[PDB]
Design a protein around this motif. Structure first.
Motif, PDB file in Angstrom:
ATOM      1  N   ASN C   4       0.820  -1.175   0.010  1.00 42.12           N
ATOM      2  CA  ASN C   4       0.169   0.128   0.011  1.00 42.12           C
ATOM      3  C   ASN C   4       1.081   1.348  -0.144  1.00 42.12           C
ATOM      4  OD1 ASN C   4      -3.028   0.084   0.073  1.00 42.12           O
ATOM      5  ND2 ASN C   4      -2.740  -1.702   1.454  1.00 42.12           N
ATOM      6  N   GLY C   6       0.076   4.054   1.197  1.00 36.01           N
ATOM      7  CA  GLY C   6      -0.008   4.810   2.350  1.00 36.01           C
ATOM      8  C   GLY C   6       0.976   4.447   3.386  1.00 36.01           C
ATOM      9  N   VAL C   7       1.203   3.093   3.456  1.00 33.35           N
ATOM     10  CA  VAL C   7       2.252   2.706   4.554  1.00 33.35           C
ATOM     11  C   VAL C   7       3.666   3.139   4.067  1.00 33.35           C
ATOM     12  CG1 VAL C   7       2.835   0.903   6.156  1.00 33.35           C
ATOM     13  CG2 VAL C   7       0.673   1.047   5.164  1.00 33.35           C
ATOM     14  N   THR C   8       4.144   4.228   4.405  1.00 34.99           N
ATOM     15  CA  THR C   8       5.615   4.649   3.975  1.00 34.99           C
ATOM     16  C   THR C   8       6.566   4.098   4.777  1.00 34.99           C
ATOM     17  OG1 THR C   8       5.432   6.857   5.040  1.00 34.99           O
ATOM     18  CG2 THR C   8       4.236   6.676   2.964  1.00 34.99           C
ATOM     19  N   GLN C   9       6.318   4.290   6.251  1.00 38.41           N
ATOM     20  CA  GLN C   9       7.158   3.893   7.293  1.00 38.41           C
ATOM     21  C   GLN C   9       6.589   3.888   8.710  1.00 38.41           C
ATOM     22  OE1 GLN C   9       7.649   6.305   9.752  1.00 38.41           O
ATOM     23  NE2 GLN C   9       7.260   8.200   8.757  1.00 38.41           N
ATOM     24  N   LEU C  10       7.516   3.221   9.476  1.00 38.86           N
ATOM     25  CA  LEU C  10       6.959   2.954  10.834  1.00 38.86           C
ATOM     26  C   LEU C  10       8.279   3.212  11.924  1.00 38.86           C
ATOM     27  CD1 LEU C  10       4.848  -0.089   9.820  1.00 38.86           C
ATOM     28  CD2 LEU C  10       4.088   1.190  11.861  1.00 38.86           C
ATOM     29  N   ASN C  11       7.890   3.966  12.783  1.00 36.90           N
ATOM     30  CA  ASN C  11       8.902   4.492  13.735  1.00 36.90           C
ATOM     31  C   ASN C  11      10.322   5.082  12.892  1.00 36.90           C
ATOM     32  OD1 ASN C  11       7.168   1.830  14.657  1.00 36.90           O
ATOM     33  ND2 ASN C  11       7.536   2.827  16.406  1.00 36.90           N
ATOM     34  N   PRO C 187       2.385  10.724  -0.220  1.00 33.31           N
ATOM     35  CA  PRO C 187       3.077  10.437   0.801  1.00 33.31           C
ATOM     36  C   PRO C 187       4.600   9.737   0.433  1.00 33.31           C
ATOM     37  CG  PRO C 187       1.323   9.246   0.816  1.00 33.31           C
ATOM     38  CD  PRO C 187       0.903  10.208  -0.274  1.00 33.31           C
ATOM     39  N   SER C 190       6.884  12.376  -1.084  1.00 33.21           N
ATOM     40  CA  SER C 190       7.342  13.163   0.223  1.00 33.21           C
ATOM     41  C   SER C 190       8.425  12.745   1.114  1.00 33.21           C
ATOM     42  CB  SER C 190       6.194  13.830   0.966  1.00 33.21           C
ATOM     43  OG  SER C 190       5.862  12.622   1.825  1.00 33.21           O
ATOM     44  N   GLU C 191       8.161  11.410   1.236  1.00 31.19           N
ATOM     45  CA  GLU C 191       9.229  10.631   2.155  1.00 31.19           C
ATOM     46  C   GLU C 191      10.614  10.635   1.413  1.00 31.19           C
ATOM     47  OE1 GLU C 191       7.491  10.043   6.152  1.00 31.19           O
ATOM     48  OE2 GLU C 191       8.034  11.439   4.765  1.00 31.19           O
ATOM     49  N   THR C 194      11.890  14.710   1.052  1.00 31.78           N
ATOM     50  CA  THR C 194      12.213  15.252   2.143  1.00 31.78           C
ATOM     51  C   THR C 194      13.476  14.821   2.833  1.00 31.78           C
ATOM     52  OG1 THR C 194      10.562  13.961   3.650  1.00 31.78           O
ATOM     53  CG2 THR C 194       9.956  16.094   2.638  1.00 31.78           C
ATOM     54  N   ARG C 195      13.700  13.496   3.070  1.00 32.94           N
ATOM     55  CA  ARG C 195      14.711  12.816   3.463  1.00 32.94           C
ATOM     56  C   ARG C 195      16.080  13.231   2.807  1.00 32.94           C
ATOM     57  NH1 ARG C 195      15.597   7.644   5.662  1.00 32.94           N
ATOM     58  NH2 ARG C 195      15.182   6.883   3.725  1.00 32.94           N
TER      59      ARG C 195
END
Lengths: 303, 303, 303, 303
Positions: C4, C6-11, C187, C190-191, C194-195
């Motif tokens: 998906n 929408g799920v780009t990263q976690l923590n 998203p 963007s991830e 931006t990084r």
């Protein structure tokens, strides 16, 4: 030739015994009339006659160009007179000077002498620059007409900001924009502005070009504004900068950078004006009217 | 008075027995010299003498204003002559006309008569508009100087786009920008442009104001450009629009909307030019030089 | 989670024994699959699993973010890796660097190793910078994905201009703008952008931020473009700058500064390209594709 | 999944028996907690679980997206809910609507019901539109969050201007720009804004897109601002328009068109505010806070 706006000059290039008839000094000071409130001819009022020219402060008493000099002063006539590294820009809608925000703690100065009159003398320039700097004034605006060339040299040697003023203003005509929305008067204003710009472009002290005090919405004025812009891209031109007339309103000129070309008539509201200057980023300062009378401590504390 | 750029006009407001001496018709056509390649006085060449004026095509043969008329034509002199709803904007860097992209299938037209010469007659206007429309021409550029006022009425009654040209061009002076970067010549160009704009602002057929064919980088030209802009905000001014001189380059003027004011001299390269016009969004068309000789089917097929 | 957008990263915060299952080195080089043409995890391809992340080059072989990496290279996966004073602006539509016009004699460089593969080694960086500078190359573009951080340090110590590239490109999807005009993919981009900007903002060698090779008209891309603009106002962002795809046309991208992000595939037309660069002010140079093969003298003479 | 800003949605496409556990109606109204001041799921507060989603007003009580909803209202949770020709532009720095200057006599309206709570009913919409129009209100701002889709249909059938508000505001975090200058929160704001724009782009009543009440200088907000601009070029976006927070100052936001998104809390200073609106060209109006309490004649006379 002193009746038509079309006839601006004759054989004029780029920039003493006296007799009076019914039809550097002033002939109204020695007494001949009632004052009312390559050779170079600097400071000749109205029109004079090799060639002809009516661009005064850039010999008849009244001329066609006198309509563009509707400023508040004493009306005399005759013969009145005989490089640095800095960037000033309007980036991001803010007046930037060498990368830092510019705060204008300026004062309007007239070319006036208590005895001679509109004739200028060198010592007065010194005791005026010293008095300005001692009272926390960092800028000077040559009110109405350009000043003597030595003034700019003294300012850029002593480090004083100068806003050059073109001798164009109609405060008596109703409406004021009659002479500025009429294409018939464009040549006179062009000859007034271009010669000033050519004469005073090589002074680091000059940081802002001013078209006029205020005469109308534009049409002819803005033509000279960006004629200066395209001819001298380094300095901004004000009339980039909006200059209110004795704003009390500040809302109206904001909702149209802002520099108060005329404010704090001499001094009520000075504290509010300077609080506005310090707080508001686009209110970058103003000029006190006037430096000298046409015959101080509060300003020093406020600035 | 016909020697100084400062003397533009005398007593001139806003917009037949003949004798020849050594010092609507042309006196060089009846034969008096060798041609070289409120009263209203429309179409008087050079300077003439109530008042004085040297703004021609807006009686002496040579004048100060002749230096601004360095166009390619026959040199005569004398007396030559006697509202719609549409929006044209430069939104998003594209020439928009009533919301649709504008394609200029135009041709440059001279004010020429085989017998009279530069004098204009009404029938020729009709057989010129009809011939233009029959050959897929939707625009006409009044080459060098403004045309007779009846031409604009015929164009806006028959629906033809008109690009108005100010009589300002220096193709013979070296450098060309000598007369356009000099402030001494600003009044003459101002009197040339403002009167044309005042005369032809009320014609829906006029869609683009043109300063000149080409005379230099600017300085004086752009002053009139946005004098028109602030005086007539509805129509764009070209010199908003970049007009190459017989571009072969197109790269150079692109890398500085574009309309080819002079292209396809009469016709090589017409196919490539029109392919460029159709493909490239900012190449919105051009004007064929010229409509008539100064003594067609390919254009019809291409447009 | 690797299906998906929408799920780009976690923590994920701001910027070895191996086992293979059916469901710094590359596991396809030692041989486990067929190649196809606060802890910190730099250079992990696709998605991996404390937390989760799929932003590669900023462990599974295929992931949701692989659709944004439609660049031309070898497809491996695994663990790949472990201040100056200058102003670059777009004043007056020209790319200005410290007041002088900027000419980009650049070349596109891949992060490639003949033996390891996409893993990078320090010596190769040295013999690449030296080889670039010896062949009149003054700029380097980190093709497709950002390079190892030591590369930027070597470039700003040796004085090499760097154009940073965000790992965003869709050259296989039909249409290409499918993933860039869809808000569902914003998203991920963007991830990705931006990084990179956060990691490489403090390098004087980096002079231009690049969004992608080319993926569509915009919508999502330009969002990151001026997110960089408002986050890093010092450096221009290209995608201010228009970057044609292997332009032959140059007319089309001019008629919409220009830097050829991809040109002169390796070398026909090099002479015409460099003549265009030298003559045309807005054609400020380009980048040669590519520096090294994915398994020179003419460029030196031309630049 | 309701703890990380990266996890925005799962399998979410483009735009009843109840049980309560410790870990269209509101479950806090029937009484289960203390209030504190292709299937489609419109109006689900916080996060809920086919797929997952936390974009509320575009089932858990607290979620990661609750930090972006720091607006002043009652905190419930659950399931809340189930073309024209006009141009609005910012030409010449003035808000133009169909060629005429736009005066905003607007009021902020909450989606509130005295009995149900945040649930909305159709009759209230009617007696709200009628009451607004009877009291000289021509605009309505959907406070904080977008309203029910039927509201826009009623507004564009009855002719009421609508300013759409994205559910993004941080009035409790110190500093407020903590969540808007952090790239980690960009995906959530993007998912909040893009879905609103996709849902409400086809309503002629919607004339202005609003990012948020106020949350910081920008960075993430402006990204969505001109994502709307490039996605929906017809409508301006405000946050083109500067929206002061309960300006008393008006000087500060002028010296940076202006529409007072929050002013005249309910009503002191109303006369001065409306005199400012009438006089000052760039002060085009404001919105009264608020239309209804969260449990009139002066406004009618002033507008």
């Amino acid at each position: 030739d002193w009746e038509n706006p079309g006839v601006t000059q004759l054989n004029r290039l780029a920039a003493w015994r006296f007799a009076w008839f019914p039809a550097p000094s002033n002939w109204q000071m020695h007494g001949y009339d009632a004052p009312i409130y390559r050779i170079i001819f600097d400071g000749v009022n109205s029109a004079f006659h090799v060639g002809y020219g009516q661009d005064s402060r850039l010999v008849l008493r009244w001329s066609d160009g006198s309509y563009l000099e509707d400023q508040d002063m004493w009306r005399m006539s005759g013969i009145f007179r005989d490089v640095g590294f800095r960037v000033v820009r309007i980036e991001n809608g803010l007046l930037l000077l060498n990368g830092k925000p510019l705060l204008i703690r300026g004062v309007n100065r007239h070319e006036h002498h208590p005895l001679h009159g509109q004739v200028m003398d060198e010592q007065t320039m010194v005791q005026d620059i010293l008095l300005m700097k001692q009272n926390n004034f960092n800028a000077v605006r040559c009110s109405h007409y350009p000043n003597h060339p030595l003034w700019y040299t003294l300012c850029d040697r002593y480090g004083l900001y100068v806003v050059d003023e073109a001798n164009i203003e109609t405060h008596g005509m109703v409406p004021m924009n009659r002479l500025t929305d009429d294409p018939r008067w464009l040549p006179a204003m062009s000859e007034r502005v271009t010669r000033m710009v050519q004469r005073d472009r090589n002074h680091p002290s000059v940081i802002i070009w001013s078209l006029g005090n205020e005469s109308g919405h534009g049409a002819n004025h803005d033509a000279l504004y960006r004629w200066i812009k395209s001819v001298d891209p380094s300095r901004p031109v004000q009339y980039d900068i909006i200059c209110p007339m004795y704003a009390r309103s500040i809302k109206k000129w904001l909702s149209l950078p802002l520099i108060l070309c005329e404010y704090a008539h001499a001094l009520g509201g000075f504290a509010k004006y300077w609080q506005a200057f310090r707080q508001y980023p686009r209110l970058q300062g103003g000029f006190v009217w006037d430096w000298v009378d046409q015959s101080l401590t509060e300003a020093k504390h406020q600035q």
